């Protein structure tokens, strides 16, 4: 449901992410974990990170944040016609990782907060609005796929 102008705002701010995918990734995850501690429980590899300092030093945390945002980016660049990128992610997330739609809302908030904190200047009212819509569309399509698969949307 985004307009062409809105997609261009999304992809323009995403350009900032692409310039440093792993650092953005690391910060989104740490924001996620620090704002909603229970999400940390879904990552067996990360149960020994007992603080932010531990989370910043973790090379697996950073690798994972890189993997995550790289995927998100492939989805956003498809501007809605993302069915092929989205399916495998909703498959793995509904079955293998057991991630509820609710946690997708938490990570969307952390994504927005990181963008806002690193790129105030480029992440104005219209960019904010458009990114919010894009992430909402991502969540909604993940939710619809989860229901088809027999899971809770």
Choose between 93 and 121: whose C-beta lies nearer to ligand HEM. 93
**Residue number with CB closer to ligand HEM (4 or 79):** 79
Q: Decide: is 103 part of the binding site for ligand HEM (CB under 6 A).
A: yes
Q: Is 24 annotated for ligand binding?
A: no
Q: Is 30 exposed, middle or buried (0-12, 13-18, 19+ CB in 10 A)?
A: buried
Is 93 among the annotated ligand-binding positions? yes
107 binds ligand HEM (CB under 6 A): yes
Query: What's the 3-state SS for the chain?
Result: CCCHHHHHHHHHHHHHHHCCHHHHHHHHHHHHHHHCHHHHHHCHHHCCCCCHHHHHHCHHHHHHHHHHHHHHHHHHCCCCCCHHHHHHHHHHHHCCCCCCHHHHHHHHHHHHHHHHHHCHHHCCHHHHHHHHHHHHHHHHHHHHHHHHHCCCC
72 binds ligand HEM (CB under 6 A): yes
Pick the piece of the chain touching ligand HEM (CB under 6 A) from 9-17, 41-49, 76-84, 112-120. 41-49
Q: Binding ligand HEM by CB under 6 A: which of 2, 13, 17, 99?
A: 99
42 touches ligand HEM (CB under 6 A) = yes
| Token couple for 2 | 């985004």
CA distance 111 to 113: 5
CB closer to ligand HEM out of 5 and 18: 18
* 17 makes contact with ligand HEM (CB under 6 A): no
- Give the annotated binding-site residues: 64, 93
- Give the annotated binding-site residues for heme b: 93
- Give the annotated binding-site residues for O2: 64
Contacts with ligand HEM by CB under 6 A lie at 39, 42-43, 45, 64, 67-68, 71-72, 89, 92-93, 97, 99, 103-104, 107
């Amino acid at each position: 449901g985004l307009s062409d102008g809105e997609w261009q705002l999304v992809l323009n701010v995403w350009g900032k992410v692409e310039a440093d995918v792993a650092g953005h990734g690391q910060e989104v995850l740490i924001r996620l974990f620090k704002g909603h501690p229970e999400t940390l429980e879904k990552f067996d590899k990360f149960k020994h990170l007992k603080s932010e300092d531990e989370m910043k030093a973790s090379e697996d945390l950073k690798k994972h944040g890189n993997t995550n945002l790289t995927a998100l980016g492939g989805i956003l660049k498809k501007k809605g016609h993302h069915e092929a990128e989205l399916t495998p992610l909703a498959q793995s997330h509904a079955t293998k990782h057991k991630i509820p739609v609710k946690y997708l809302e938490f990570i969307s908030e952390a994504i927005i907060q990181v963008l806002q904190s690193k790129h105030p200047g480029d992440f104005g009212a219209d960019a904010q609005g458009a990114m919010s819509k894009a992430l909402e569309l991502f969540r909604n399509d993940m939710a619809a796929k989860y229901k088809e698969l027999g899971f809770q949307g």
